[PDB]
Design a protein around this ligand. Structure first.
Ligand SMILES: Nc1ncnc2c1ncn2[C@@H]1O[C@H](COP(=O)(O)OP(=O)(O)O[C@H]2C[C@H](n3ccc(=O)[nH]c3=O)O[C@@H]2COP(=O)(O)O)[C@@H](OP(=O)(O)O)[C@H]1O
Length: 124
């Protein structure tokens, strides 16, 4: 029974690499973090910042979530992120992803005690 917070770190945290590495970064990471285990997840963002820095976003700019809830927060500063999007020539179980390194503000949804990120909403 993985916690939502643990799931968040699994699906979005990559503090090892400070920037999107190889052109094959997404193909490798999406596979390794078990994101293509029963479906190719269409889009996934990895954050290359410390866990503490990302957790801090939960006490930063409160903004509306794409779903209407209000437990979302935007980082005051931009962070190093890598967007992984599925390519059309991608078919389960041979999932294929386009890698995209960027520096943007991230928006996460937080929950619990402690108040930690559990969902990645968007980057701006
Ligand atoms: N306000 C909220 N909005 C959305 N979810 C919320 C909210 N508050 C709490 N949650 C809860 O957080 C857990 C993880 O959310 P989930 O969408 O499953 O994962 P993700 O990694 O964010 O995966 C998401 C984000 C990722 N994604 C999307 C866009 C992008 O730029 N990058 C990226 O990684 O793609 C997926 C689809 O994008 P979308 O739902 O925004 O359309 C869930 O709980 P459980 O799975 O434990 O039941 C959920 O109920």
């Amino acid at each position: 029974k993985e916690t939502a917070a643990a799931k968040f770190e699994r699906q979005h945290m990559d503090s090892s690499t400070s920037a999107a590495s190889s052109s094959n970064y997404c193909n490798q990471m999406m596979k390794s973090r078990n994101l293509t285990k029963d479906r190719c997840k269409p889009v996934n963002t990895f954050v290359h910042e410390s866990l503490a820095d990302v957790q801090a976003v939960c006490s930063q700019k409160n903004v509306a979530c794409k779903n209407g809830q209000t437990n979302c927060y935007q980082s005051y500063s931009t962070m190093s992120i890598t967007d992984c999007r599925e390519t059309g020539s991608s078919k389960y179980p041979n999932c294929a992803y386009k890698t995209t390194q960027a520096n943007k503000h991230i928006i996460v949804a937080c929950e619990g005690n402690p108040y930690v990120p559990v969902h990645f909403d968007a980057s701006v």
